[PDB]
């Protein structure tokens with residue numbers, strides 16, 4: 001089915017990557033600047049970039065792996081919880097409570113909308129319309145995604161929708177027949 | 180006999196060295212003269228690899244037209260330049 005994650009291993013890999021991105025962005029901030037700057041103002045007038053990269057990396061991957069491990073499935077919700085943790089780390093830099101709540105909620109919603117579309121910038125090859133079976137079914141078969149039919153099985157309607165509202169396993173007519 | 184072995188590597192080192200005197204030279208036209216030296220190191224490498232024709236095409240075209248154009252610009256025009264101070268490039 002699935003495979004659980006190594007939260008400590010993926011977290012320390014991301015911590016090293018965020019440390020590296022912080023050093024690169026601090027050097028790019030020195031060299032693209034004005035005023036008296038030296039070799040030691042890399043981490044002095046840094047603007048706190050290495051804290052941004054480090055905290056965002058560790059929080060997103062730790063909350064993503066922990067939420068994927070306690071739910072025992074991988075879907076778009078884990079990106080929502082991880083993006084909420086990222087928004088918590090980015091929103092604590094502005095030391096205000098309603099700001100913080102806004103950063104958490106909106107960053108979590110944006111990352112959940114990201115992770116629900118596949119969590120990929122690029123395309124998936126087998127899932128797109130162009131590389132998948134489309135059009136009508138040629139004979140009767142299990143109608144896969146992207147396919148059209150004329151008539152659907154009623155057993156599927158009872159299994160997917162329910163046995164309730166106006167919906168029945170037998171139409172209301174021949175359930176009421178004279179013999 | 181094996182004194183003639185490391186020539187290519189020597190030119191590589193020599194070419195490396197020449198670029199540091201291009202980007203760091205107090206006078207401009209002295210650094211453009213170091214660039215002329217770098218064309219000569221290139222033509223050494225092109226003879227050394229087996230392309231003796233190109234080496235003289237580089238000395239004809241790059242040294243004798245493009246560098247002459249550059250020196251000819253720097254003469255009768257005004258260019259300010261600052262020295263390689265440690266304080267301005269230690270941030271880089």
Ligand SMILES: CCCCCCCCCCC(CCCCCCCCCC)(CO[C@H]1O[C@@H](CO)[C@H](O[C@@H]2O[C@@H](CO)[C@H](O)[C@@H](O)[C@@H]2O)[C@@H](O)[C@@H]1O)CO[C@H]1O[C@@H](CO)[C@H](O[C@@H]2O[C@@H](CO)[C@H](O)[C@@H](O)[C@@H]2O)[C@@H](O)[C@H]1O
Nearest residue numbers: 074075076115116117118119124126127128132144145146
């Ligand atoms: C208009 C409001 C905004 C709505 C935004 C749309 C985004 C909604 C996306 C839904 C959708 C595109 C359809 C959209 C088309 C209309 C687009 C509308 C406009 C677009 C702007 C992307 O579905 C994505 O869902 C994500 C989670 O929900 C998954 O995340 C990831 O999970 C991990 C998994 O490996 C990743 O490892 C991980 O990296 C991610 O975490 C992705 O796997 C998946 O690609 C569905 O695509 C998919 O659906 C499945 C069904 O199950 C289909 O399988 C079919 O069914 C089976 C037999 O029945 C058989 O398997 C198969 O034989 C058959 O093929 C596929 O064919 C496929 O096509």
